[PDB]
Coordinates of all heavy atoms in Angstrom, one line a residue:
Chain B
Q1 N 32.8 -4.4 -15.1 CA 31.8 -3.8 -16.0 C 32.1 -3.9 -17.4 O 31.1 -3.5 -18.3 CB 31.4 -2.4 -15.5 CG 30.8 -2.4 -14.1 CD 30.6 -0.9 -13.6 OE1 31.3 -0.1 -14.0 NE2 29.6 -0.8 -12.7
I2 N 33.4 -4.1 -17.9 CA 33.7 -4.1 -19.3 C 33.6 -5.6 -19.8 O 34.5 -6.3 -19.6 CB 35.1 -3.5 -19.4 CG1 35.2 -2.1 -18.9 CG2 35.5 -3.6 -21.0 CD1 36.6 -1.6 -18.8
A3 N 32.3 -5.9 -20.0 CA 32.1 -7.3 -20.6 C 30.7 -7.2 -21.1 O 29.8 -6.4 -20.6 CB 32.2 -8.4 -19.5
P4 N 30.2 -8.0 -22.1 CA 28.9 -7.9 -22.7 C 27.9 -8.3 -21.7 O 28.0 -9.3 -20.9 CB 29.0 -8.7 -23.9 CG 30.2 -9.6 -23.8 CD 30.8 -9.2 -22.5
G5 N 26.6 -7.7 -21.9 CA 25.5 -8.1 -21.0 C 25.4 -7.4 -19.6 O 24.6 -7.9 -18.9
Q6 N 26.4 -6.6 -19.3 CA 26.5 -6.1 -18.0 C 25.9 -4.6 -17.9 O 25.6 -3.9 -18.8 CB 27.9 -6.0 -17.4 CG 28.6 -7.5 -17.3 CD 30.0 -7.5 -17.1 OE1 30.8 -6.4 -17.6 NE2 30.6 -8.5 -16.6
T7 N 25.7 -4.2 -16.7 CA 25.2 -3.0 -16.3 C 26.1 -2.2 -15.3 O 27.1 -2.8 -14.9 CB 23.7 -3.0 -15.8 OG1 23.7 -3.8 -14.6 CG2 22.8 -3.4 -16.8
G8 N 25.8 -1.0 -15.0 CA 26.6 -0.2 -14.1 C 26.8 1.2 -14.7 O 26.5 1.4 -15.9
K9 N 27.4 2.1 -14.0 CA 27.6 3.5 -14.4 C 28.6 3.6 -15.7 O 28.4 4.3 -16.6 CB 28.2 4.3 -13.4 CG 27.1 4.7 -12.3 CD 27.6 5.7 -11.2 CE 26.7 6.2 -10.3 NZ 27.2 7.2 -9.3
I10 N 29.6 2.6 -15.7 CA 30.4 2.6 -16.9 C 29.6 1.8 -18.0 O 29.7 2.3 -19.1 CB 31.8 2.0 -16.5 CG1 32.6 2.8 -15.6 CG2 32.5 1.7 -17.8 CD1 34.0 2.3 -15.4
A11 N 29.0 0.6 -17.6 CA 28.4 -0.2 -18.6 C 27.2 0.4 -19.2 O 26.9 0.1 -20.3 CB 28.1 -1.5 -18.2
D12 N 26.6 1.3 -18.5 CA 25.4 2.1 -18.9 C 25.6 3.4 -19.4 O 24.9 3.9 -20.4 CB 24.2 2.0 -17.9 CG 23.9 0.6 -17.7 OD1 24.0 -0.2 -18.4 OD2 23.1 0.3 -16.5
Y13 N 26.4 4.2 -18.8 CA 26.7 5.7 -19.0 C 27.9 6.0 -19.6 O 28.2 7.1 -20.0 CB 26.5 6.4 -17.8 CG 25.1 6.4 -17.2 CD1 24.8 5.5 -16.2 CD2 24.1 7.2 -17.7 CE1 23.4 5.6 -15.7 CE2 22.8 7.2 -17.2 CZ 22.6 6.4 -16.2 OH 21.3 6.3 -15.6
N14 N 29.0 5.0 -19.8 CA 30.1 5.3 -20.4 C 30.2 4.7 -21.9 O 30.3 5.3 -22.8 CB 31.4 5.0 -19.6 CG 31.3 5.5 -18.2 OD1 30.4 6.2 -17.9 ND2 32.4 5.4 -17.4
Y15 N 30.2 3.3 -21.8 CA 30.6 2.5 -23.1 C 29.8 1.2 -23.0 O 30.3 0.3 -22.3 CB 32.1 2.5 -23.2 CG 32.7 3.8 -23.7 CD1 33.2 4.6 -22.7 CD2 32.5 4.2 -25.0 CE1 33.6 5.9 -23.1 CE2 33.0 5.3 -25.4 CZ 33.5 6.2 -24.5 OH 34.0 7.4 -24.9
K16 N 28.9 0.9 -23.8 CA 28.0 -0.3 -23.8 C 28.7 -1.3 -24.8 O 29.1 -1.0 -25.9 CB 26.6 0.2 -24.3 CG 25.8 0.9 -23.3 CD 24.3 0.5 -23.4 CE 23.6 0.9 -22.1 NZ 22.2 0.3 -22.0
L17 N 28.7 -2.5 -24.2 CA 29.2 -3.6 -25.1 C 28.1 -4.5 -25.4 O 27.3 -5.0 -24.6 CB 30.2 -4.5 -24.3 CG 31.4 -3.7 -23.6 CD1 32.5 -4.6 -23.1 CD2 32.0 -2.7 -24.7
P18 N 27.9 -4.7 -26.7 CA 26.7 -5.4 -27.2 C 26.8 -6.8 -26.7 O 27.8 -7.5 -26.4 CB 26.7 -5.4 -28.7 CG 28.0 -4.8 -29.0 CD 28.8 -4.5 -27.8
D19 N 25.5 -7.6 -26.6 CA 25.4 -8.9 -26.1 C 26.2 -9.9 -27.0 O 26.5 -10.9 -26.5 CB 24.0 -9.3 -26.0 CG 23.1 -8.2 -25.1 OD1 23.7 -7.6 -24.3 OD2 21.9 -8.2 -25.4
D20 N 26.5 -9.6 -28.2 CA 27.2 -10.4 -29.2 C 28.6 -10.0 -29.4 O 29.0 -10.1 -30.7 CB 26.3 -10.5 -30.4 CG 24.9 -11.2 -30.2 OD1 24.9 -11.9 -29.2 OD2 24.0 -10.9 -31.1
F21 N 29.3 -9.7 -28.4 CA 30.8 -9.3 -28.7 C 31.6 -10.5 -29.1 O 31.4 -11.6 -28.7 CB 31.3 -8.8 -27.3 CG 32.6 -7.9 -27.6 CD1 32.5 -7.0 -28.6 CD2 33.7 -8.0 -26.7 CE1 33.7 -6.2 -28.8 CE2 34.7 -7.1 -26.9 CZ 34.7 -6.2 -27.9
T22 N 32.6 -10.2 -30.0 CA 33.6 -11.1 -30.4 C 34.9 -10.3 -30.2 O 35.3 -9.5 -31.1 CB 33.5 -11.6 -31.9 OG1 33.4 -10.6 -32.8 CG2 32.3 -12.5 -31.9
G23 N 35.6 -10.6 -29.1 CA 36.9 -9.9 -28.9 C 37.4 -10.2 -27.5 O 36.8 -11.0 -26.8
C24 N 38.4 -9.4 -27.0 CA 39.0 -9.6 -25.6 C 39.1 -8.3 -24.9 O 39.5 -7.2 -25.5 CB 40.3 -10.2 -25.6 SG 40.4 -11.7 -26.5
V25 N 38.9 -8.2 -23.6 CA 39.1 -7.0 -22.6 C 40.3 -7.3 -21.8 O 40.1 -8.1 -20.8 CB 37.7 -6.7 -21.8 CG1 37.7 -5.3 -21.4 CG2 36.5 -7.1 -22.6
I26 N 41.3 -6.7 -22.0 CA 42.7 -6.9 -21.4 C 42.8 -5.6 -20.5 O 42.6 -4.5 -20.9 CB 43.8 -7.0 -22.4 CG1 43.6 -8.3 -23.3 CG2 45.1 -7.2 -21.7 CD1 44.4 -8.3 -24.5
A27 N 43.3 -5.9 -19.3 CA 43.5 -4.9 -18.3 C 44.6 -5.2 -17.3 O 44.8 -6.3 -17.0 CB 42.2 -4.5 -17.5
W28 N 45.3 -4.1 -16.9 CA 46.3 -4.4 -15.9 C 46.5 -3.2 -14.9 O 45.7 -2.1 -15.1 CB 47.8 -4.6 -16.6 CG 48.3 -3.4 -17.3 CD1 49.0 -2.3 -16.9 CD2 48.1 -3.2 -18.8 NE1 49.4 -1.6 -18.0 CE2 48.7 -2.1 -19.2 CE3 47.5 -4.1 -19.7 CZ2 48.8 -1.6 -20.5 CZ3 47.5 -3.5 -21.1 CH2 48.1 -2.4 -21.4
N29 N 47.1 -3.4 -13.9 CA 47.5 -2.3 -12.8 C 48.1 -1.3 -13.5 O 49.1 -1.4 -14.4 CB 48.2 -2.9 -11.7 CG 47.3 -3.7 -10.7 OD1 46.1 -3.4 -10.7 ND2 47.9 -4.6 -10.0
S30 N 47.8 0.1 -13.0 CA 48.6 1.3 -13.4 C 48.8 2.1 -12.3 O 48.8 3.4 -12.4 CB 47.8 2.0 -14.6 OG 46.6 2.5 -14.2
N31 N 49.1 1.5 -11.1 CA 49.3 2.4 -9.8 C 50.5 3.2 -10.0 O 50.5 4.4 -9.5 CB 49.4 1.3 -8.7 CG 48.3 0.5 -8.5 OD1 47.2 0.7 -9.1 ND2 48.4 -0.7 -7.9
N32 N 51.6 2.7 -10.4 CA 52.9 3.5 -10.5 C 53.1 4.2 -11.8 O 54.1 4.8 -12.0 CB 54.1 2.5 -10.4 CG 54.1 1.8 -9.0 OD1 53.5 2.2 -8.1 ND2 54.7 0.6 -9.0
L33 N 52.0 4.4 -12.6 CA 52.1 5.0 -13.9 C 51.1 6.2 -13.9 O 51.4 7.3 -14.4 CB 51.8 4.1 -15.0 CG 52.9 3.0 -15.2 CD1 52.3 1.9 -16.4 CD2 54.2 3.6 -15.7
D34 N 49.8 6.1 -13.4 CA 48.7 7.0 -13.6 C 48.4 7.7 -12.3 O 47.6 8.8 -12.4 CB 47.5 6.3 -14.2 CG 47.7 6.0 -15.5 OD1 48.5 6.4 -16.2 OD2 47.0 5.0 -15.9
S35 N 49.0 7.3 -11.1 CA 48.6 8.0 -9.8 C 49.7 8.9 -9.5 O 50.9 8.7 -9.8 CB 48.4 7.0 -8.8 OG 49.6 6.3 -8.6
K36 N 49.3 10.0 -8.8 CA 50.3 11.0 -8.2 C 49.9 11.3 -6.8 O 48.8 10.9 -6.4 CB 50.2 12.4 -9.0 CG 50.9 12.3 -10.5 CD 50.8 13.6 -11.1 CE 51.2 13.6 -12.5 NZ 51.0 14.8 -13.3
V37 N 50.9 11.8 -6.0 CA 50.8 12.0 -4.6 C 49.5 12.9 -4.3 O 48.7 12.7 -3.4 CB 52.0 12.6 -4.1 CG1 51.9 12.8 -2.6 CG2 53.2 11.6 -4.3
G38 N 49.4 14.0 -5.0 CA 48.3 15.0 -4.9 C 47.0 14.6 -5.4 O 46.0 15.4 -5.4
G39 N 46.9 13.5 -6.2 CA 45.7 13.0 -6.8 C 45.7 13.4 -8.3 O 45.8 14.5 -8.7
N40 N 45.5 12.4 -9.2 CA 45.4 12.7 -10.6 C 44.0 12.8 -11.0 O 43.2 11.8 -11.2 CB 46.1 11.5 -11.5 CG 47.5 11.9 -11.8 OD1 47.8 13.0 -12.0 ND2 48.4 10.9 -11.9
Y41 N 43.5 14.0 -11.2 CA 42.1 14.3 -11.6 C 42.0 14.6 -13.1 O 41.0 15.3 -13.4 CB 41.6 15.6 -10.7 CG 41.7 15.3 -9.3 CD1 42.9 15.8 -8.5 CD2 40.8 14.7 -8.5 CE1 42.9 15.6 -7.2 CE2 40.8 14.5 -7.2 CZ 42.0 14.9 -6.5 OH 42.0 14.8 -5.2
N42 N 42.9 14.1 -13.9 CA 42.8 14.3 -15.3 C 41.9 13.3 -16.0 O 41.8 13.4 -17.2 CB 44.2 14.3 -15.9 CG 45.1 15.5 -15.6 OD1 44.5 16.6 -15.2 ND2 46.4 15.4 -15.6
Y43 N 41.5 12.3 -15.2 CA 40.5 11.4 -15.8 C 39.1 11.6 -15.2 O 38.9 11.6 -14.1 CB 40.9 9.9 -15.4 CG 42.4 9.5 -15.8 CD1 43.5 9.8 -15.0 CD2 42.5 9.0 -17.2 CE1 44.7 9.3 -15.6 CE2 43.8 8.7 -17.6 CZ 44.8 8.9 -16.8 OH 46.1 8.6 -17.2
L44 N 38.2 11.9 -16.1 CA 36.9 12.4 -15.8 C 35.8 11.3 -16.0 O 35.9 10.4 -16.8 CB 36.6 13.7 -16.7 CG 37.4 14.8 -16.5 CD1 37.2 15.9 -17.4 CD2 37.2 15.4 -15.0
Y45 N 34.8 11.3 -15.1 CA 33.8 10.3 -15.1 C 32.4 10.9 -15.0 O 32.2 11.9 -14.2 CB 34.0 9.4 -14.0 CG 35.1 8.3 -14.2 CD1 36.4 8.7 -14.2 CD2 34.6 7.0 -14.5 CE1 37.3 7.6 -14.5 CE2 35.5 6.1 -14.8 CZ 36.9 6.4 -14.8 OH 37.9 5.5 -14.9
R46 N 31.4 10.4 -15.7 CA 30.0 10.9 -15.7 C 29.2 10.0 -14.7 O 29.4 8.8 -14.8 CB 29.4 11.0 -17.1 CG 29.9 12.1 -18.0 CD 29.2 12.0 -19.4 NE 29.7 13.0 -20.3 CZ 29.5 12.9 -21.7 NH1 28.7 12.0 -22.1 NH2 30.1 13.9 -22.4
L47 N 28.4 10.6 -14.0 CA 27.3 9.9 -13.3 C 25.9 10.0 -13.7 O 25.0 9.2 -13.4 CB 27.5 10.2 -11.7 CG 28.8 10.2 -11.1 CD1 28.8 10.5 -9.6 CD2 29.5 8.8 -11.4
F48 N 25.7 11.1 -14.5 CA 24.4 11.4 -14.9 C 24.3 11.5 -16.5 O 25.2 12.2 -17.1 CB 23.9 12.8 -14.3 CG 24.1 13.0 -12.9 CD1 25.2 13.4 -12.3 CD2 23.1 12.4 -12.1 CE1 25.3 13.4 -10.9 CE2 23.2 12.5 -10.7 CZ 24.3 13.1 -10.1
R49 N 23.1 10.8 -17.1 CA 22.9 11.2 -18.4 C 21.4 10.9 -18.5 O 20.7 10.3 -17.7 CB 23.5 10.1 -19.4 CG 25.0 10.3 -19.6 CD 25.5 9.7 -20.9 NE 27.0 9.5 -20.9 CZ 27.6 9.2 -22.0 NH1 26.9 8.8 -23.2 NH2 28.9 9.0 -22.0
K50 N 20.8 11.5 -19.6 CA 19.4 11.5 -19.9 C 18.9 10.0 -20.2 O 17.8 9.7 -19.8 CB 19.0 12.4 -21.0 CG 19.2 13.8 -20.8 CD 18.9 14.7 -21.9 CE 19.1 16.3 -21.6 NZ 18.7 17.0 -22.9

Side-chain angles (χ1 to χ4, degrees):
Chain B
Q1 292 175 334
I2 304 168
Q6 295 169 333
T7 57
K9 286 184 178 180
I10 295 187
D12 290 344
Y13 295 98
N14 308 3
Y15 286 97
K16 282 213 162 193
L17 311 187
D19 306 335
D20 291 343
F21 205 37
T22 59
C24 307
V25 202
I26 298 165
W28 60 92
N29 283 334
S30 64
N31 304 343
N32 297 335
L33 296 170
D34 288 338
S35 64
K36 288 179 189 173
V37 179
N40 261 331
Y41 304 95
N42 289 337
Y43 300 93
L44 295 167
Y45 280 77
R46 292 178 184 168
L47 310 184
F48 306 96
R49 294 198 192 187
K50 296 178 180 180

